[PDB]
Structure 1
Amino acid sequence: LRITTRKTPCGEGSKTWDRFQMRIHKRLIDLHSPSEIVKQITSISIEPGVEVEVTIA
């Protein structure tokens, strides 16, 4: 996610720009098991800043 912006909040300077970036990494991990196991695996190792999406069938 790349957003370029002017540094100057009035537009008087030497036309200097900030290239702000967000980097999003995506992971896909697949299992083949009944749905009660994936819940107890996911729910224990909860870590902030990393989030989990669970799709069933």
Structure 2
Amino acid sequence: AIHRIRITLTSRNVKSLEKVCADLIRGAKEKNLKVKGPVRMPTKTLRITTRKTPCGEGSKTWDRFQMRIHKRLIDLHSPSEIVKQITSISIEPGVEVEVTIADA
């Protein structure tokens, strides 16, 4: 054996992250691995507000830069071993994974 695995996915764009979640669970459903629905962690918004001008002169304008980090969690809980079963990741650029055993 009994094993349980968790795959976390981090990305900056929603469309890619949703695609890699979708085909990961789709492959596992066909593979009769029990899958817990992809839970969406709250999005991290890294906000940096600088000043537009490179000098001191101007009318005091500020530029708000924004960065969004989206996080997902997918749990695979099959009665038998899992790591030897599923060995493909099928990732597109901009998506970072981190495999973790459910004990941690």
Q: TM-score range by the shorter chain?
A: 0.7 to 0.9
More displaced stretch, 27-36 vs 9-18: 27-36
TM-score by length of 2: 0.45
**Deviations, residues 20-56 of structure 1 (Å, cap 9, x unaligned):** 0100111011111379645664635121111111012
**Deviations, residues 2-24 of structure 1 (Å, cap 9, x unaligned):** 00000000010001111001001
More displaced stretch, 36-45 vs 26-35: 36-45
Gaps of at least 5 residues in structure 2 are 1-45
Query: Which one has the largest radius of gyration?
Result: 1
Q: Closer, same or farther in 2 for the Cα pair 1:39/1:28, shift >3 Å?
A: farther
Q: Closer, same or farther in 2 for the Cα pair 1:16/1:52, shift >3 Å?
A: same
Query: For residues 40 and 32 of structure 1, what CA distance do their matches in structure 2 show?
Result: 12
Ranges of 4+ aligned residues in structure 1 off by more than 6 Å: none
Gaps of at least 5 residues in structure 1 are none
**Cα-Cα RMSD:** 2.5
Q: RCO (CA 8 Å, sep 6+): is it higher in 1 or 2?
A: 2
Q: What is the aligned counterpart of 1:6 among 39, 51, 60? A: 51
Give the aligned length: 57
Over the matched positions of the two proteins, sequence identity in percent amounts to: 100
